[model samples]
Target: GERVFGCDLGEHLLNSGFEVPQVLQSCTAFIERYGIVDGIYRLSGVASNIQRLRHEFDSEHVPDLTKEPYVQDIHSVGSLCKLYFRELPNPLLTYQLYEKFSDAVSAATDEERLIKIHDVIQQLPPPHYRTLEFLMRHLSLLADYCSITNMHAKNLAIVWAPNLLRSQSVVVEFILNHVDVLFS
Candidate 1:
């Protein structure tokens, strides 16, 4: 089988019924369950471990993180999840909508910014929309445990914004803070 990582979002969906990529579903599930580690996303994993996991994912194999070797560093799984997004050809926010998102974020007022962002989000393809929704929801949950994880919405945005959209951290942070309203 071909690689799952770095493939186009629509291409992956065409062959599978999942709203988001399998890598995302698996990694986020693992993170939410057992990988609630501090700095999970901000910290870099072992280079070798990350590369190994990357190979497994790209080769269409979702490695079990609960088992030995992998369990040694939950950060590897976190890094792998982010890597999937970083490697995407068009990103979670499509390149075509980049300018619009930028303008939306640059709106003068907070209410206007949210409205423009919502409008721009509606323009995304189904795969992108659903996947982005999944990610934002997950991040919101992660932020709920910020006291222990030390990854508040702002911190998470700094780490994830580039991977998701290449936007200013503020845009991603805003979405994380108001995920429910934005996705409503």
Candidate 2:
């Protein structure tokens, strides 16, 4: 989710006049690096659409989720992806990691998981580096907990680490600071 947030920031930049060619090229580079082009593009589109709607509305209020066409589009894409992750063949290892992480959260004693999560967060590189590091640390913790609890850790590393890291570069460091809050 944070990773998606990061991508959204990038799209926000593009809509705010940061140069579409530059943004698109950056996105293409991200796709080359991580192989999550579709996911990243969808996230970027969602961010851009939301920003456009916000501008049209002239406020920062959250959009009506039920009626907006753009919102519906994003939700539909997200929902379809969730379903595909749950039921499709191979289901992508990253999706598997999330499943295992969710299972760990369900099984752990509340106190244990919370403390571990907090500790992981504390060890994160800093707010500037938080997005990717936090995600990686959380997924790693999930994998360890899953191993202890007999849950699947398959492809967790593949799905969480590289993609999330790439997202940090595109969204957090580059987009959010440069485009969204600052320029807009």
Candidate 3:
């Protein structure tokens, strides 16, 4: 009987910004909406969706990591991340440099490619670099779950080959072998 909403949660948020629960809800929603749980496929974006998804962090949506929803959410984020690459107007790597870079990566050893890839990653626009970094980090979480999700680096390579900075064989091999090195 004593509580009014605005003076409490709303004013609290106004004072401190986004109470933690909202942030967690966003995570669960992102996972449930994008994840491929129970064979449910999301992310129906097309080739011209220049708009990107908003990632307003409110902790209310965070999943407990050991739970199915959390694991499934990881899968969803993984699949959605792949879908994001698929539907971009411009790929993470440009078309002109596709073969040129792929050939370079292919010719180089894994250690060499990982070393040199930083030069290229640094050259991206701030937005591209930011996007690539986040997606790479999220996708890195997904890569190790290949056996469980059956969407290993090779399978995801197929999803990403045409969308990444370089060729499938090169980028896929690089991601599979050297995810630890390329944070950007």
Supply candidate 3's per-residue lDDT for 111. 62
| Ranked candidates (TM-score, high to low) | 1, 3, 2
Better model by TM-score: candidate 2 vs candidate 3: 3
Worst 10-residue lDDT window for candidate 3 reads 50-59
**Residue-wise lDDT of candidate 3 within 7-81, one digit each (tens)?**
223232344444322322343356434453322222333332212221211212233444553443344443434
Residues 1-184 of candidate 1 have per-residue lDDT tens digits of: 3767878888887776777888888889989988887887999889898899889877777788888877778998899889899998988888988888888989999999999999999999999999999999999999988988999999999999889885368878887887899889
lDDT of 1 at 154: 94
Best by lDDT: 1
Q: Residue 17's C-alpha lDDT in candidate 2?
A: 44
Which stretches of model 1 miss by more than 4 angstroms?
none
lDDT on C-alpha atoms for all candidate structures = 0.87, 0.32, 0.46
TM-score of 1: 0.94
lDDT of 2 by residue, 1-184 (tens): 1112223433333444433212223222332333222332223245565445434323323344345464344423332222222332222222324433333334356555444333333333322222333233333333444433332234443332234332012122222212222222
Over 4 Å off in model 2, which ranges? 1-59, 75-119, 124-184
Give per-model TM-scores. 0.94, 0.23, 0.52
The runs of at least 3 residues in candidate 3 whose Cα sits more than 4 Å from the true structure, single-residue gaps closed, are 1-29, 32-83, 165-169
